[model samples]
Target: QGQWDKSITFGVSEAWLNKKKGGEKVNKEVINTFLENFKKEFNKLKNANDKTKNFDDVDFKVTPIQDFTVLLNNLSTDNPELDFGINASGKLVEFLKNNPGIITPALETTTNSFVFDKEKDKFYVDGTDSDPLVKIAKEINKIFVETPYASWTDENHKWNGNVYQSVYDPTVQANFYRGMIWIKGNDETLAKIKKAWNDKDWNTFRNFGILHGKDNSSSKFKLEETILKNHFQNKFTTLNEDRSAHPNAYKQKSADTLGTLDDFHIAFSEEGSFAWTHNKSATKPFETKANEKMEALIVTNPIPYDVGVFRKSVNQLEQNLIVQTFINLAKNKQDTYGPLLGYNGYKKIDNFQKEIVEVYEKAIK
Candidate 1:
C-alpha cells in the first residue's frame, strides 16, 4: 500500500488533482514521479561547470518579472505531456490578472530569488545568473557577456531583443563594438546613422544601442555637408598621395573612401580600450570577514585586471564638432593639425581653445 501510494504521488501538483483522477491514473502518477526523479538527478549532475564546482557555488533564485519576461517564452521539453500552464503562458494568467500593471509572481520570484538580491536599500543582481536545473536545455546567458551592441532596454543588454533570437552564424559574430565599425557604408540606414552622429543628438547616439562606436555619426563618420564641403579633404590624405613622390600627386589626390569621415582617434573613445579601475571592498560584516580570510590565504586575493570599458562611445555629432573645430583653427592659422590636437591641443595651450573655451564660458561659470 505504501509503495503504491508513494509511486502514485507526485510532488506539488499531485495535491491539486481530483480524487477520481488520482485514483484512476496510476501510470500518469508513476510517470510524474519518474519525471521528478529525473529532474532531481539531472540537476545534481548538470551544474558542474568550471565556475560551479560545488552546490554552494550556485544561486537557484528566479528573476523578477521585468527580466523574467526575457526567458519565459518557448521553454523546451522532451516530454510535452508534462506541460504546465504557467510554463506555457508565463507569469500564469492569474498572476497577470492580479498585478495588472506590474510583473508577475513567478517572474518576481525567479528574479528576486535567483537573479537579484535586495539589500537594505540597494538592489544587486548577479553577473553569474546560470544554473543547470533552472536553465536546463536552454543556453546559459551571462549578464555581462559582450554582445554585438549596447541597448537602452536593459542597462547591460539584459533585455535586448537580439539576445532572444535564434540566429546562429558559422563564424563567431563580432562583438557589438566591432559590428558598429563594420556597418556597410553607403547604405541609407548607415547614412542616417552617420548624420545623426554628426548632429550629436543624444537619441541618435544611443539609437544603435551599442558601445563600440560614437553615438553620433558626425562624431564618428563624415556627414553629407562636411563631405560635400570637402571639410575633411586635407585630414585624410589618399594612400597614393602619402606614398607618392610628387606633392601635387598626393595633395590633389583623394583616397578610396571607407565611407565614414576620418576623425582623430580618441583613446578614451576606443571600444574596450580604456581601463576603468576601482578597488572593490565590502563593508558588510560577512564580506569583511571573508576578505580578511582571503587576504590571509593570498597576499592579494582581489587582484586587479584591465578590462576595456568606457562611459560611452564618441558619437558622430561629437566627432563632427571636433572636426569642425579643427577646421576653424586651421583656417585661422596656416598650420594644419589633427583633430586630436584640437581636442587635446587646446587643453595644452590654454583652456580658451574652441571646444574648451565654449565649455568654460558656458558650463563652468
Candidate 2:
C-alpha cells in the first residue's frame, strides 16, 4: 500500500517538505505517501524480467474515447501485438469495402458442349439437347454455308454442297473442262472453234481437236460420242430430260456441270457469260493475217491527221468502231503496236476526240 512512500520521501527536496516560517505547515506525510506508492510501481516495472513480464501475448479491444477521435497513435510503442492486429484487420476491411462483389460462390452445376441435329433442325448443349441460337446457326449454314462465309460447323463435317453439285451434275464438269481447254488453246484454234460455234456446227467444233484420234475419222467420232454421252448423259437419248433444246433445264444442267464455286466465279467475271452471244462475235477481228500486217500502219498513223483522213473515208459509226477495234487490237498485240504508237494508240484516239470536241464546241458557240 505504501511501497513508494520511502523513495518519494527521499526523492523530494527538503524545502518542498518544509513550509516558510509564517506560512501554513505543508502536508509532508500525504505527499510522502503518494510518492512512495508511485516509486514502488515504477521499481516493480524497471526490475521485471522477460519471464515475469507479460510482454508477448496480448488481446486489445479498441474503444473510441470521444466523438471523431481515438487514442490509437503510438500504439506500436506501447503494445506491438495489438498494433499488428489492428493494421492487418484494417487493411483487409478496406480492401473488401473498395472491391465489392469480387468474391463469388463456386458453380454447383455446368452443361456439356454444344451439338446440332441437322435433320431435326435442333441444337443441343451438354446435359441438355438445344437452343434457338443453334437452330439459327444451322439454318445459316444451309443458306450462306456458314457464319462469316467460312466457319467450322457440324454440316461442313458431314456434307459439302459443292461436292454434291459436282457428283450429281455432269454439265458442271463439262463446263469446267471447256474453260480449261478454251484458255489453253491457241488463237487460231479458238477462232475456228468460235466460227464452228456461230455456225451451229457442233460436229465441226468437236472435230477441231476436241476429240482423240486426229486422222482417224471413225475413232474421232466415237470418242466425241463417248465424251458427249458421259457429260450430257440422257440428253441424246429417249430420256425425258431434253439436254439439247430446253432452255430452263439446259441452263440448270450447264450450271450444275460448272467448276468449283471459286472457278465459276472467276470465269463469269473475267471471261464474260458462259453462253455465247452472236452479236458480240467470239472471233478476234485483229487476229487475222491481214489485220496483223496492218498493225504497223495503224500505230504509225498520226492522230487527227491520219485519224481525220480515215474518218472522212468511213462513216461516223464505222470510224468509231474501226478506231476502237484497232485500240483493242493494240492492247492484245502490245508488242506489235505499243512501241509504235507510244501508248497502244489510246492517246491518239484521245487527241482525235479532243479535236472533234473543240470543233463541235466552236460551232455551237
Candidate 3:
C-alpha cells in the first residue's frame, strides 16, 4: 500500500455531490502527500535561477499583493503550462471579463523607429550603439549647432556661411552666451528649444530672448533676425583655408571650437555659473569637490600654476574671463598648451566638467 494507504475519503451525500457539480472529492491526506513528493521531483529538474522553489521563503504577512505578484511572475515564467485566473467566489470568468487590463500580458512594440521588449519590460536597441538614450543625447548635441550664437557652416565663397571675423569676437561671445541660456535654462524651455532646432522654427528662437533678460520686443526681433541673416557668415575659416599648415591643425581647430564653446557656455550661463559657486548645501558638489581635487593635484603633480589658473578661470569668468579667454585662444595655435594645460595633469578635470553639466541638467528644473 502507498504511504496514504489509510482508507480516508471525503464522505458527502449524493445531494451534496450534486450541488457541488459531481466533482470527485479526494482524500486530503493523499493530495498533500502526492504534492510533497511531486514538489521534490520538480525541484530536481528546476534551474538554479528559478525563484519558484523558494516561494515559501517569501514574506506574505506584509506586502501580500507584492509577494503574490512576484510569485505569480516567477511561476508564469517557469511553467508556461499554468494558466492563472482570479476569482470572486465562483465568478472568475465574469471578473476577468469585466477587468480586462487587470492581468494583461505585457506588450512589445517596434514602430516609429522605437523598439521595446515585453519580456524584459524595457526598450531595446538592435546594435550596441543604437541605444535610445544615446540617440537622444546625440540629438541634443546636434541641436547645439542650431543655436543663434554657435550656429555656423562650412563652405567656400565670399559672403558665404563659411567665415566669422575672429574666434574670440565679443559680439560672437555675447551671442553664444545668449544662445546658451536660450537652450540650457529650463526643461519647459528645452522642449521648445528642441522643437525649434528640429523644425528650424526661427519664431521659437526669437521668443527665448525674453527669458535671458532681453525685455525689449524689437531687441528680441532684431536678435533673431541678425542670427538668421548671419547664420552662414559665422564660420571663422575652413580647413581648406590653410591646407599647407600642420596636418592636425584642422583637428586641433575642431577640438578648440568644442572646448571653447563648452567653456563659454559654462562661464556665462547662470546654471553653469552657480554650478561652481561654493555652497554648503549643494545637492551636487562637483565644482567644490573638483576644486579640492585640483588643489591636491597641484601639490603632488608637475602641473603648472598657469594650468591650475586656467582650470579655476573656467568657472570664475568674472575675474579670469578675459585672461582665460586669451589663453584658450592661444591654445588653438600652440600644440604644447594641450599637453601642459589641458587634460594631461588634471585628469579629474574632464570628470568634474561632466558632473557639473549633469548637475546643471538636474538642477535647472
The models' CA-based lDDT, in order, is 0.22, 0.24, 0.23
- RMSD of candidate 2 to the truth, in angstroms, is 46.8
Better of 1 and 2 by lDDT: 2
TM-score of each model, in listed order: 0.16, 0.13, 0.17
Error of 1 at 99 (Å): 3.0
TM-score of 3: 0.17
Winner by TM-score? 3
Cα misplacement distance, residue 77 of candidate 1 (Å):
22
lDDT (Cα, tens digit) per residue for candidate 1, span 1-365: 00001111111222223223435844344434434443343334434344323323111111112222322231222121211112212122322344342321110001111121111121111111232211210221122122222221333323222121122221221111100022222245445644553454423423333212222222122111122123223433432233243322111111112112222110111111101111121212112111111000000001001111001122222222222332333334322211111111111112112322232222111
lDDT of 2 at 290: 25
Looking at candidate 1, what is the lDDT of residue 112? 11
**lDDT of candidate 3 over 1-365, digit per residue (tens):** 10211111111122322332135443333334433433333333222325333323211000112222233343234222222211111121122245432332211101111011111111212212354322433333332322322223221111112122122121111100111122333345445544554455544443433221121111122222223333323332321332234232212111111222221111112211211122222232222211111000000000011111111111121112222222333333322222211111111123322322232222111
Q: Tell me the deviation in Å of residue 319 in model 3.
A: 23
Question: Against the true structure, what is every candidate's RMSD?
Answer: 28.7, 46.8, 31.0
Which of 1 and 3 is the better model by lDDT?
3
**lDDT preference between candidates 2 and 3, better one:** 2
